[PDB]
Design a protein around this ligand. Structure first.
Ligand code: SF4
Ligand code: SF4
Ligand code: SF4
Ligand code: SF4
Ligand code: FES
Ligand code: FES
Ligand SMILES: [Zn+2]
Lengths: 159, 181, 91, 118, 94, 291, 688, 47
């Protein structure tokens, strides 16, 4: 979620393989059934979520091309969707992707203190990933539960 | 660049619109007399901004070309030359020029020898007459100038975009029923 | 390293390269390419570098900005007005 | 502000300050500047031929005024008497040599000129 | 009609497609082009249509020699007679 | 026999071509192979007709498509390893092949394949456009080259290919017969049933499970390579990756991503490669097999 | 429905379908724009066309807003001025200071609009946006810092062409328009991307750093690299030519030109013959005078009996040159205008309908079904391919018999052999019923198919199929039979009436009028004497005992007839290089020296002779209708109609190398080496 | 004294004369065989 283009990485090359599991294929079939038969182009986001779940919480370029081929839509459309939506990690992340809310309510509640405490505990800076592939800090916008701030989210799943 | 229809109905205006039909004078023309007759019969009878068929008119070295000033002892090639009359539109590179074009008829002359001199590589033109194009408000004025100066003229009529219906709603269109075949 | 090879053309933006930099002495009547090639890559911590070609405004070229956050880490970028090449100090 | 002999300057690194924008050519009232440019092998936008006809040029200074990078500068040299007409067809070689020779005084004047607005 | 190939080198019909002055030659060609082509397989029989064009039958015999016949307001019989005369005059021409 | 994977799951990836960087799903592979078969049928290929294979390692996709199309159409394929015009002519005379698919840019000795073919059959140079071949062999009706340029008396692979229409296809594909010969390697002929049996035996010997991806290095024209590659993918739904002429270094670079992947290694590639720059890439090879 | 509106208090009437911008343009008031394009979709991103409406508080986007009855538009109001200034300030914010180095300095609509409407001074004093450059190939140079995110390039790529690579990737000020992955934009219409891009973000790489707009003189002419014909503008700074562009001609050009016609003019800059030459037996070429060359040629002609004299028609032969050559050969008694026996076009030049596209270039927009036979519109006439893409996206179905090329639009591949044609002719094929059901069907056949050895049989089969299926219908008043040619010289020869089938098997004196394609040593007898009228020495100049320089299409004032039968006038931009003379003048001088003077001494007299031969060629930029189409295309009884069992192929292998000029060009060589490997594929792109 | 180089370069910028064969050359029928002088490599033919 840093660059608006493909980062030149040896571990994210076109040669990297990716194949959906049969459970993922069944889920894709269910999603297509939910969506209109002709409008298969609307299933990009569920497919990206399934790819993230299958992989280590990131969407490989090969996986994106596979999604485009399955949906019979240009790969450029999938690229645009992934780049536009920030919840899709286009590069590998750590075991714990901490997402600290930094909007005005959390800032008033003391989000900066929580961020400093997290940095001190994890021995890493905001945004930067820890040396070991264990922690990845990020600053995000309003996650919704402002009345309960300060707040964080892990793996885009647990608040 | 377009006066109201039949706004001018003068004899001079009608003569300017009309083009003369050639008379075979040279030996080659007499030999090709049938070709001259065919060309006279086929070429458009009158020239108007609403025309659509291009044509080439031979120079009329007649008493009408008495107003030319480019027939001098030193230079005797300017008169009788063939020009091109067309509307120069804005380049495709840009759509809103600071100085828009296409509002006037351009008269152009084919350029003669153009050579780069050895001492400095600077460009030189064998003739200085065809360096700058001429501009006229109306094709009638351009043709009148050509007749007065004794220059022959090819005329190429302009082409413009065909008007098409434009609406932002066309971006969103319902493809149809899925079962449709 | 054939200058006309496809790889060389792609790397040099589809222009025939001159490794010796001597042909420019005649083509453009100057050794400025050779002179500028001596300057090494300037490493800048920030992702975006501002260049004015001098110490003060109006003493160089118009103020320009160059992105050092290349899609491939560490790739130098050359200023268009001057041949100075800047790269991010990856750490 | 004296306008003497046209010359071409360089950056302190030695790179040419002239980029082939042809603003000076367009502004030259006497059409005394001829510029032809081709991309350099390194990819720089540099001219391949930059000629000034000193006999056809009026020492107005529009070239230096229109130069956006202070590449062409009318330096203070005025003792440029020539015996052959061909010697007054200044070329890129001549302009670069003049700029190299007269850079100190030209730079000194440019310092004050730039500081005046401040 | 069978000797056109040997007698002539080319036949051409230049006329108008919407003029009564050409109507006769137009109809004759439209009716007899295939007949003449079958009679002479490889002979060149060119047809040219131009609005407000004077009808003309151009017979090229040999050595860059051509004869042009004005066929305006001529019935199909007159066109046949003119073509026959052009074909027969090949011996006199060469 | 060749549509079980399509019936089960056609969206799954079928084969990968690392050398030319193109991956085909089961549906795409079936479509291309059917197009090739329809093209041959339209040209007039019948059951038992002989097609000679003279395509180098790099054209892995062409080799695989030709093999599968020939299997579908009941056309026997004879690989030929000839570096000389004498050997090429001897093979042509012995086999009486109806077609000859080759790689023009490949170099044999001091001459290219196209040059050798022209030398063997000078009639191709002056052959008319759209004219049938009148050659000494009297049976080599079709000559096909996998090259960018075109030559007289030869047709390109894409030109030969014919993609059948859904409602405008008058061509017919004869039912694939298992006993019909498919490959003629040396003096031994392999049928489709024999190739399937070889696939099963190799899988059992190498513990090749369904989810284990297979890699093939070198020429794919070998019967063992065909068995353990595209045929294995079409039978058991496995995932095959062809590296073509890529050396061990690039093969390992590709292998890194794949886990517990079987590898088929060619002796020519082994001789060509000097040593493994990064042995860590093969730390999880799972199993290794040799042709 | 006509509706009355007011523009600056000026009454006007427009139909409801009009938008505010369209009404303003019709009434003559200009409105600035950056993203709106006439031929592209409607987008409201830039919002520079904002105007003031009395009853609308918010500014109204003129480009994407329809007129309303009683609307009071104030385009000269202070509020409109403020809106334009604000939008211009926002656009210029973050815009790099690259005007001196930007190749669009003189043709920058952004600069023009900022000078005319926007403010004169900026307030943004902060770090600007910086974007990495991208590599789109040797045809487009990219400077993304100058991009304004107007998406015009993306819309052109997705709509005008079938390539889908460009897109707006990212969100916010960090959004970047372009390919997410690093790949080249290698579409055949990549040149028009620069034209559509208004802020010099994408520029003409070959033309980069060359010149400026204000020092260029423009001439309108017609393209020759493609038999389709295109209305182009040639810009020159003295002798040098540069920046060939399209010009609006909707009937044939539709504002777009192909990369070949856009970047093949560089071939004229090198490998040019500039003096008459003679080759010795040892093979040492030596320059000679025109007088000596013409005298020796005339002596050879006089010595040689007319029986063993033949000619070859070149690719770029024009009406005047072909007429002069025909008259000279007729006066010498020579009637065979072909020497090559390997491949000859099998079509009779009697009727124009039987060797010209009966339906015009716009006939695809009207036909419901289009069947191609050995035709690759993407490689030949790419503009026609884009028109076919538009037609098939609106209403049209495309069928193909031959090679399955990567067309930008979906097509139904019936086959590649003559079996499909035989079945269709017999009527058993379902496509016969399909054509009968369809209204206004069209058949497009490439010239290679008719040039096949069985070209006559294939042509007769096409005639009978068309007659049976109604492609030539009197009730519909439709003639969908078409032939796509590959040689403008061949088209001109057919127009003048030269028979392509007349071939001299054994010729002692060969006149090659600038022919460089299909030449082989076997065609020329070892003992023959060859006179080659040409402009490039890549080919044909090595078979020539005498070589005579000639003029090119940019250097010759002549007439050209395109594939659809439209006759245009190619104008003189620069004089022929060196000692080159016009080919018709050379032929006239040769005739006079040989003793058979021609009856024309100038262009006017030569065009009178052209009128004698075929008067319709004197109506420039016009297609003369023919009423003998049915008679010409009628199927005869007893014809062979026997096809061969071989694939139908396409002659084009490398789109960037098809003629001598393209082969001699450097930009074309760069495009070839950069695109051939990426575009070559033995398989079909199943995605489209 | 080196004016020839400059003049030739200026002439070639707009029109470069074709370098015709000189001296004895190989002949194939009525055709002189000469190797192509194009610096660019024919990648498709080579591979
Ligand atoms: S002083 Fe004036 S006329 Fe002379 S070169 Fe400079 S701008 Fe041109
Ligand atoms: S001297 Fe200055 S104005 Fe003239 S081209 Fe060079 S940089 Fe541009
Ligand atoms: S596009 Fe930008 S840099 Fe180029 S001329 Fe226009 S404003 Fe200047
Ligand atoms: S590259 Fe050009 S055309 Fe494309 S969005 Fe940017 S400014 Fe518009
Ligand atoms: S303020 Fe933290 S989730 Fe909204
Ligand atoms: S032109 Fe109207 S918003 Fe761009
Ligand atoms: Zn700089």
């Amino acid at each position: 979620s840093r660059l608006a283009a493909h980062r030149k990485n040896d571990d994210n090359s076109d040669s990297v393989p990716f194949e959906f599991t049969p459970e993922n294929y069944k889920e894709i079939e269910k999603i297509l059934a939910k969506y209109p038969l002709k409008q298969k182009r609307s299933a990009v986001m569920p497919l990206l979520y399934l790819v993230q779940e299958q992989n280590n919480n990131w969407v490989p370029l090969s996986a994106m091309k596979k999604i485009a081929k399955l949906l019979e839509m240009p790969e450029i459309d999938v690229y645009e969707v992934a780049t536009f939506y920030t919840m899709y990690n286009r590069e590998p992340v750590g075991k714990f992707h901490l997402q600290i809310c930094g909007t005005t309510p959390c800032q008033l509640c003391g989000s900066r203190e929580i961020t400093k405490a997290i940095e001190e505990y994890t021995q890493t800076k905001l945004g930067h990933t820890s040396a070991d592939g264990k922690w990845t800090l990020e600053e995000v916008e309003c996650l919704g539960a402002c009345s309960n701030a300060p707040m964080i989210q892990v793996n885009n799943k647990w608040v | 660049m377009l006066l109201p229809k039949n706004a001018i109905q003068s004899a001079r205006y009608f003569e300017i619109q009309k083009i003369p039909a050639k008379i075979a004078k040279t030996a080659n023309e007499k030999i090709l007399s049938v070709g001259v007759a065919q060309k006279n019969n086929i070429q458009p009878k009158t020239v108007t901004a609403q025309g659509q068929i291009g044509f080439v008119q031979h120079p009329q070295l007649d008493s009408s070309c008495q107003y030319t000033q480019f027939y001098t002892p030193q230079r005797r090639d300017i008169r009788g030359r063939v020009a091109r009359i067309y509307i120069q539109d804005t380049n495709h590179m840009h759509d809103t020029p600071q100085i828009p074009e296409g509002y006037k008829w351009t008269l152009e002359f084919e350029r003669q020898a153009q050579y780069k001199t050895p001492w400095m590589g600077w460009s030189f033109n064998g003739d200085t007459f065809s360096k700058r194009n001429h501009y006229f408000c109306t094709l009638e004025d351009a043709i009148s100038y050509c007749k007065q100066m004794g220059f022959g003229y090819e005329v190429s009529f302009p082409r413009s975009r065909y008007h098409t219906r434009k609406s932002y709603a066309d971006n969103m269109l319902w493809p149809g029923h899925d079962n449709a075949v | 390293l054939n200058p006309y090879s496809y790889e060389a053309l792609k790397e040099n933006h589809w222009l025939v390269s001159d490794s010796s930099k001597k042909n420019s002495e005649w083509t453009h009547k100057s050794n400025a390419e050779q002179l500028i090639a001596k300057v090494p890559i300037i490493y800048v911590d920030s992702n975006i570098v501002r260049c004015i070609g001098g110490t003060e405004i109006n003493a160089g070229h118009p103020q320009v900005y160059i992105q050092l956050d290349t899609r491939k880490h560490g790739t130098p970028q050359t200023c268009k007005y001057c041949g100075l090449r800047y790269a991010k100090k990856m750490d | 502000l004296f306008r003497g002999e046209h010359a071409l300057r360089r950056y302190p690194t030695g790179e040419e300050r002239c980029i082939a924008c042809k603003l000076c050519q367009s502004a030259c009232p006497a059409r005394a500047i001829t510029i032809e440019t081709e991309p350099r092998p390194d990819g720089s936008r540099r001219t391949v031929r930059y000629d000034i006809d000193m006999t056809k040029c009026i020492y107005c200074g529009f070239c230096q005024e229109a130069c956006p990078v202070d590449a062409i500068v009318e330096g203070p040299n005025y003792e440029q008497t020539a015996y052959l007409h061909e010697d007054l067809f200044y070329d890129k070689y001549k302009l670069l040599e003049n700029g190299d020779k007269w850079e100190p005084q030209i730079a000194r004047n440019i310092e004050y000129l730039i500081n005046q607005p401040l | 009609q069978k000797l056109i190939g040997t007698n002539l080198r080319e036949l051409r019909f230049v006329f108008c497609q919407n003029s009564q002055r050409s109507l006769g030659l137009r109809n004759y060609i439209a009716k007899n082009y295939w007949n003449l082509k079958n009679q002479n397989p490889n002979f060149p029989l060119i047809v040219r249509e131009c609005e407000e064009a004077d009808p003309y039958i151009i017979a090229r015999y040999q050595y860059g020699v051509e004869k042009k016949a004005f066929a305006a307001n001529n019935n199909e019989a007159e066109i046949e007679n003119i073509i026959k005369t052009l074909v027969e005059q090949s011996n006199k021409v060469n | 026999p060749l549509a079980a994977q399509l019936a089960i799951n056609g969206n799954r990836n079928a084969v990968r071509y690392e050398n030319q960087n193109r991956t085909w799903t089961f549906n795409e592979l079936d479509a291309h192979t059917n197009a090739f078969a329809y093209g041959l049928t339209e040209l007039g290929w019948k059951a038992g007709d002989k097609l000679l294979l003279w395509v180098e390692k790099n054209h892995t996709s062409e080799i695989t498509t030709a093999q599968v199309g020939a299997a579908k159409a009941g056309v026997t394929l004879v690989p030929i390893y000839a570096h000389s015009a004498e050997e090429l002519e001897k093979a042509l005379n012995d086999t009486k092949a109806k077609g000859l698919l080759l790689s023009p840019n490949s170099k044999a000795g001091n001459s290219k394949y196209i040059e050798v073919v022209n030398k063997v059959i000078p009639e191709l140079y002056n052959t008319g456009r759209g004219s049938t071949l009148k050659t000494k062999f009297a049976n080599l009706q079709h000559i096909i080259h996998t090259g960018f340029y075109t030559f007289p008396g030869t047709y390109k692979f894409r030109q030969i290919m014919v993609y059948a229409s859904k409602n405008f296809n008058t061509l017919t594909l004869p039912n694939v017969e298992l006993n019909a010969p498919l490959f003629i390697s040396g003096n031994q002929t392999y049928t489709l049933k024999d190739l399937i049996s070889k696939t099963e035996e190799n899988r059992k010997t190498s513990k090749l499970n369904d989810n284990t991806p297979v890699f093939v290095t070198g020429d794919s024209r070998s019967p063992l390579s065909f068995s353990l590659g595209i045929l294995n993918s079409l039978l058991h739904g496995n995932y095959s990756v062809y590296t073509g002429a890529q050396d061990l270094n690039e093969v390992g670079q590709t292998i890194r991503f794949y886990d517990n992947a079987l590898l088929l290694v060619d002796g020519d590639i082994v001789k060509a490669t000097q040593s493994l720059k990064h042995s860590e890439n093969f730390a999880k090879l799972g199993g290794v097999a040799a042709n | 429905k006509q509706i009355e509106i007011f523009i600056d208090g000026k009454p006007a009437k427009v139909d409801d379908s009009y938008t505010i911008f369209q009404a303003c343009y019709e009434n003559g008031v200009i409105v600035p724009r950056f993203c709106y394009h006439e031929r592209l979709s409607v987008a409201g991103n830039c919002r520079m066309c904002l105007v003031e409406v009395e009853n609308v508080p918010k500014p109204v986007a003129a480009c994407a807003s329809q007129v309303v009855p009683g609307m009071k538009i104030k385009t000269k109001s202070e509020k409109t001025r403020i809106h334009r200034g604000n939008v211009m300030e926002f656009l210029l914010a973050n815009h790099p200071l690259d005007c001196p180095i930007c190749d669009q300095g003189g043709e920058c609509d952004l600069q023009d609009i900022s000078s005319v409407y926007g403010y004169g001074i900026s307030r943004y004093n902060e770090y600007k946006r910086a974007v990495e450059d991208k590599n789109y190939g040797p045809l487009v140079a990219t400077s993304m810092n100058r991009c304004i995110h107007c998406t015009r390039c993306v819309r052109f790529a997705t709509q005008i062409a079938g390539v889908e690579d460009l897109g707006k990737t990212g969100r916010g000020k960090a959004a970047e328009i372009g390919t997410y992955v690093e790949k080249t934009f290698n579409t055949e219409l990549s040149g028009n991307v620069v034209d559509v891009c208004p802020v010099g973000a994408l520029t003409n790489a070959p033309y980069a750093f060359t010149s400026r707009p204000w020092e260029l003189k423009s001439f309108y002419t017609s393209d020759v690299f493609d038999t389709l014909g295109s209305a182009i503008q040639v810009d020159t700074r003295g002798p040098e030519i540069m920046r060939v562009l399209p010009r609006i001609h909707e009937e044939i050009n539709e504002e777009w030109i192909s990369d070949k016609t856009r970047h093949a003019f560089d071939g004229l800059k090198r490998q040019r013959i500039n003096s008459p030459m003679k080759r010795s037996k040892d093979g040492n070429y030596e320059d000679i005078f025109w007088e000596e060359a013409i005298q020796t040629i005339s002596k050879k002609c006089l010595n040689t009996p007319s029986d063993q004299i033949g000619a070859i028609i070149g690719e770029f032969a024009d009406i005047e040159s072909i007429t002069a050559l025909k008259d000279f050969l007729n006066r010498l008694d020579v009637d065979n205008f072909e020497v090559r026996q390997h491949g000859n076009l099998k079509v009779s030049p009697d009727f124009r309908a039987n060797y010209l596209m009966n339906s015009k270039i716009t006939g695809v927009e009207d036909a419901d079904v289009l069947l191609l036979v050995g035709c690759n519109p993407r490689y030949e006439a790419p503009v026609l391919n884009a028109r076919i893409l538009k037609s098939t996206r609106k209403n049209l179905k495309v069928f193909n018999i031959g090679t399955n090329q990567d067309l930008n639009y979906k097509n139904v591949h019936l086959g590649n052999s003559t079996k499909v044609l035989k079945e269709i002719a017999d009527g058993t094929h379902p496509f016969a019923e399909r054509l009968k059901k369809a209204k206004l069907p069209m058949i497009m056949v490439g010239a290679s198919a008719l040039e096949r050895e069985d070209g006559a049989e294939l042509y007769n089969t096409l005639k009978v199929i068309s007659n049976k299926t109604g492609v030539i219908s009197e009730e519909k008043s439709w003639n969908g039979f078409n032939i796509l040619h590959k040689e403008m010289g061949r088209i001109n020869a057919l127009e003048l009436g030269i028979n392509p089938t007349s071939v001299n098997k054994n010729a002692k004196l060969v006149f090659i009028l600038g022919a460089d394609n299909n030449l082989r040593p076997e065609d020329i007898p070892a003992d023959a004497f060859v006179v080659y009228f040409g402009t490039h020495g890549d080919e044909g100049a090595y078979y020539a005992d005498i070589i005579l320089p000639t003029a090119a299409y940019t250097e010759k004032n002549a007439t050209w007839v395109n594939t659809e039968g439209r006759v245009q006038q190619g104008r003189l931009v620069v004089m022929p290089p060196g000692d080159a003379r016009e080919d018709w003048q050379i032929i006239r001088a040769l005739s006079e020296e040989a003793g058979v003077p021609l009856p024309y001494d100038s262009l006017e007299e030569l065009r009178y002779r052209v009128a004698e031969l075929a008067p319709h060629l004197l109506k420039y930029d016009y297609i003369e209708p023919t009423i003998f189409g049915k008679v010409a295309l009628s199927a005869q009884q007893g014809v062979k109609t026997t096809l061969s069992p071989t694939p139908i192929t396409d002659y084009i292998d490398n789109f960037y190398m098809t003629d001598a000029i393209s082969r001699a060009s450097v930009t074309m060589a760069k495009c070839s080496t950069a695109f051939n490997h990426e575009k070559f594929s033995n398989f079909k792109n199943l995605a489209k | 004294l080196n004016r020839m180089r400059f003049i030739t370069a200026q002439r070639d910028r707009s029109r470069a004369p074709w370098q015709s064969p000189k001296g004895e050359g190989v002949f194939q029928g009525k055709k002189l065989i000469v190797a192509s002088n194009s610096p660019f490599i024919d990648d498709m033919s080579i591979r």
